[PDB]
Swiss-Prot record, chains A, B, C, D:
Outcome of mutating S227D: No effect on sorting from the ER to the vesicles, redistribution to apical membrane, or endocytosis
Signal peptide (from-to): none
Annotated GO MF terms: glycerol transmembrane transporter activity; water channel activity; water transmembrane transporter activity
Cellular compartment(s): Apical cell membrane; Basolateral cell membrane; Cell membrane; Cytoplasmic vesicle membrane
Keywords: Cell membrane, Cytoplasmic vesicle, Diabetes insipidus, Disease variant, Glycoprotein, Golgi apparatus, Membrane, Phosphoprotein, Repeat, Transmembrane, Transmembrane helix, Transport
Record's comment describing the protein's domains: Aquaporins contain two tandem repeats each containing three membrane-spanning domains and a pore-forming loop with the signature motif Asn-Pro-Ala (NPA).
Source organism of this protein record: Homo sapiens (Human)
Name under which the protein is recorded: Aquaporin-2
Similarity-based family: Belongs to the MIP/aquaporin (TC 1.A.8) family.
Effect of substituting R250Q: In NDI2; exerts a dominant-negative effect on wild-type-AQP2 in that it interferes with its trafficking to the apical membrane; is a loss of function instead of a gain of function mutation on dominant nephrogenic diabetes insipidus
Gene designation per UniProt: AQP2
Taxonomy of the source species: Eukaryota, Metazoa, Chordata, Craniata, Vertebrata
Length: 253, 253, 253, 253
C-alpha cells in the first residue's frame, strides 16, 4: 500500500458517476419525447461500452458492485480492491444521480428511473429475471477479459456494452433493469423510493456470482492451484503400480 | 471419449437457454410498451453476438441446430459432437422458454413469440424466406470462424450477432424469424402451437446446408483431401508426356 | 485467364442478390408494422457489413457498381474484373429483387422500395445528396481496405456497414437512398418505375469517383509510379548544382 | 513548414463538412417522418465513427474544435496544427451546413438543427450537461488513441462514434447536443439564431479540457518530462543518506 491503485479506485468513481448520470437521464419520462426500450437499452449499453473502453486499462471498468463481487468470487480482484471499488461505485453512483436531479427541470425528473416492478410482476419473478440478466453479462465480461484468449482480442468494450444493452432489452419490462445495485440505489436514495429494493441487490449479486463460478470453475480455466497437493498423487501415482509390480513379484518369491 | 467436450456440450445448453429466454421475452406483446421490429431484431442479434463472444472458445456457439448441421455438412464438427449439440440446443431451448413462461405475468405472455406466418404469406413463401435468412448467417459464421483468415481477425461475435439481427429485420414480417429450429420449437412446445412448424425446420436446415456447401466447396477452401488420389495423376502427369516423347521417338526408329 | 476469379465474380452475384433481397424487403410499406428510417438504415447497413465480412476475402465485396467504379478510378481492380463485377451486380440485384416480389404478398409489395424523390426535392438537389452519400462510403471503404494501415486492422465490415447505414439515415428523406445503381435499378426494372432513374446512376458514380480520387490522390498514398521518370530528375538533380559549381569555376578560369 | 500537414489540415475540412451535413440533415423536422432521439443519436455517432475511420490516419479526426483543444491542453497536437484545425473545422462546418440549406426544400429545413435549450432547462443547467457530454467523449478518444495500449487495439472509430451517440442520447433533451462548437455554430450562422450560443462553446471546451487533463495527468500517463530535473534529486537522493552515514561517523570521531 499503495500506488496507482488509488487512482484506479478513482477511475471507477468517475465511471459510475458518468454511467448513472447519462443512464438514468436518458431513461426519464420526457413529455415532449419519450424513451423507447431500445434507446434506453442503447443508452446504458453504450455508456458501459464507452467506459470499459475509456477506463478499461485503469480499472477493469467493473462499474458495478455485482460485477466486482463476481470478480471477487472468481478471484480476479483483491479483497481490499473490491471493497474500495464498491464503495466508490455506490458513491460515484449517487453522485451523478444527484447531478442529474439538479440538472433536470422539475416537471420531467419524476421517477428518476428508479428500478421498480412493472406489469404486475412479483418481486419473486422480478428477482429471478435480474439473476439471469447479470449472469449473462458476467459471462461476457469474463470471456472478453480472459487473458488465455488474446487471438480474438476484440471486443471487450463493445461486446460488454451491447451485452448490457441486451440485458435492458428484456429486463426493462420486468424491472427497468438494474443489473447493478449501484445503479438502482442512487435513484432510490435521492428519490426516497426503496420499494422492493432488495430485488436489485440479490438478483444481480446472485446472477453475478453464478456467472463468475461457471466461468471460473464449471468451464475453465485450466491451470494449477498448486495447493491441490499434486506431490502426494505423484508418490502413489507411479509407485502404486510399481508396488503392484513389486509386491506381486515378492508374492511370487 | 471423453473430456472437456462434455462441458462444451454444456456450454451450448446454457447458450440456447439464455438466447431463447431473452429473445422470446423481448419479442412479447407488452401492452404498455410494444416491441418494434428493430428492437426485436437487436435483441436476438445482440443475444447471439453476446454468446458467440462468451462461449465462443468453449463451443463455437452454434446455438442453433441448423448452424450445427451447416457445420456438419461442412465437416467442421464431429458426428457425435453434432448430435449432443442439437440435443442440448433443443433442451436448452425449451428450458429457457419455460423459465420465461414462469417469469412472465399471464396477461402478456400470450403468443410467447412462437414463429407464425404473417401478412397472408404462404408456408411456401415463408419457407423460402427462411432459407435465405439462415444461409446468409451461415455464410457469415464461416467467413468469421475461418482459420485461413486471421489477419482480419475481428469480429466474429459482433458480425454474427448483427447478421442474426439482419435476419430478423426482414424475416419477422414473414415469420417472426426462426433461423433456428430450437428457437421456434421451444415456444411451439410450451404453447402447443405447432402450426406450419415444419417451415421452421426446413427453411433453416436448407439455407444452412446450402450456406455450408457454398463456403466449403463453391468458394474455398483450397486444401488437399489427399483422398483425391493425386498419386495416380502424377504417374500419368509427367509420364504421359514422357511417353509421347518416348513413344514418338521409338516410332521414329 | 482464368481461375478463382470466376468464383469471386460469382461471390458478388450472391452478395448483391442477398443485399437487395433483404434490403428492399425490409423497407417495404408493411401495413401492420411500418419501417422507420433507422430500421431501414440498419437493415442495409447491416446487410453490407455482413457481406463485406462474409465475402470480403473472396471479392472485396464491392456489392456496388459505383464502388467498383470508385475502385477502378483508383486502380484497385482490373478493367476486366470491374466489368464482370458490375454485370453480376446488376444481374445479382434484379435476381433478389424478383425473388422478393415472388415471396411477398400482393398487398404490401407496393413500391418495392424503388428509389424515388421525396418531400418535393428536385432531381438536381436529390442527385447532389446522392453524390455525398456515396463519396463518404467510398472514403470509408478505402481507409479500411487500405493495406498501408494494418495496425488498426478492424473494422472494415462493421465500419462500412454502419457507413452505409449513415448514408441511409440522411439519404432516405431525399431519395430513399440509392448509393448503389444496382440497388436502385432492380426495383425500377421489376416495377417499371424509372422516374428520375438517372439520378441514382450519376449521384453515386460521381460521389464514388470523387471519393476514389481524393483518397487515391488528394490524400495518399505515397508510393512511386516509377513512370514519373525520376531518372531524369536525378541527372539534373545533383548535376545541375555540380554544373553551377563546375561552370562557375571555369568562368573563374 | 510544411508538408503533408496541409492535406491533413484539409482532411478535417472534409470531415466537419460531411459530419455536419449528414448530422444536421438527419435531425431536421421532417413532416412526413420525424427523427427519434436514437436515430438522431445514431446518425451523428455513426457519422463520427465513420470519419475517425476514414480520416483517422490522416488527421486524428478531431472533427471538433473542443476535441482539438482537449488535444492541445494534453499536448497531443502542435499549437499551429491546432489553430489550422479549428479554423478548418469552423469553415468546414458552415460549408456543409450551407450545402444542406441549399439541398433541403424550404418547408422542412426550418430550425436546421440549431442547438437550442429545451424543456425549460436553464443555460446554467444546459451548459453543465454539455460539460459532461464532451468530457466523456474526450475520455474515450484518448483511451482509444492511446499509443501505450495497442494490445486492445480496436476500436477507436466505432467506440468513439458510439460515444458521440451516447452523448446525444442524453444531450438532445437538454440542448439537442453540441459537444462540438463547430457543429453548433454552422446552423446558428446560416439561420441567424445565436440564442445562448456561448453555452455550446463553454460546456464543450470545459468538459473537453477537464477530460484531457484527467487522462493526461490525474490518470496517466507515466513517462518522464525530463524537465522534472531528476538530476537534482539523484544528487541528494543517495548522497543525503551517505551524508547521514558519513556525517554521523565524523561526529563519532
Amino acid at each position: 500500500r499503495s500506488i496507482a491503485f488509488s487512482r484506479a479506485v478513482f477511475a471507477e468513481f468517475l465511471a459510475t458517476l458518468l454511467f448513472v448520470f447519462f443512464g438514468l437521464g436518458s431513461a426519464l419520462n420526457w413529455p415532449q419525447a419519450l424513451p423507447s426500450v431500445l434507446q434506453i437499452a442503447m443508452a446504458f449499453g453504450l455508456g458501459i461500452g464507452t467506459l470499459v473502453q475509456a477506463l478499461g486499462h485503469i480499472s477493469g471498468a467493473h462499474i458495478n458492485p455485482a460485477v466486482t463481487v463476481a470478480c471477487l468470487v472468481g478471484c480476479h480482484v483483491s479483497v481490499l480492491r473490491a471493497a474500495f471499488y464498491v464503495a466508490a461505485q455506490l458513491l460515484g453512483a449517487v453522485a451523478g444521480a444527484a447531478l442529474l436531479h439538479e440538472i433536470t427541470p422539475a416537471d420531467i425528473r419524476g421517477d428518476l428511473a428508479v428500478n421498480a416492478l412493472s406489469n404486475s410482476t412479483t418481486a419473486g419473478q422480478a428477482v429471478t429475471v435480474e439473476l439471469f440478466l447479470t449472469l449473462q453479462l458476467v459471462l461476457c465480461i469474463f470471456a472478453s477479459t480472459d487473458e488465455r484468449r488474446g487471438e480474438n482480442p476484440g471486443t471487450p468494450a463493445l461486446s460488454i456494452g451491447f451485452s448490457v444493452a441486451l440485458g435492458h432489452l428484456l429486463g426493462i419490462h420486468y424491472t427497468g433493469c438494474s443489473m447493478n445495485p449501484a445503479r438502482s440505489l442512487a435513484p432510490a436514495v435521492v428519490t426516497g423510493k426503496f420499494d422492493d429494493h432488495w430485488v436489485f441487490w440479490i438478483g444481480p449479486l446472485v446472477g453475478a456470482i453464478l456467472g463468475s463460478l461457471l466461468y471460473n470453475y464449471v468451464l475453465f480455466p485450466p491451470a494449477k492451484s498448486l495447493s491441490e497437493r499434486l506431490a502426494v498423487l505423484k508418490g502413489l501415482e507411479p509407485d502404486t503400480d510399481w508396488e503392484e509390480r513389486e509386491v506381486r513379484r515378492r508374492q511370487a518369491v
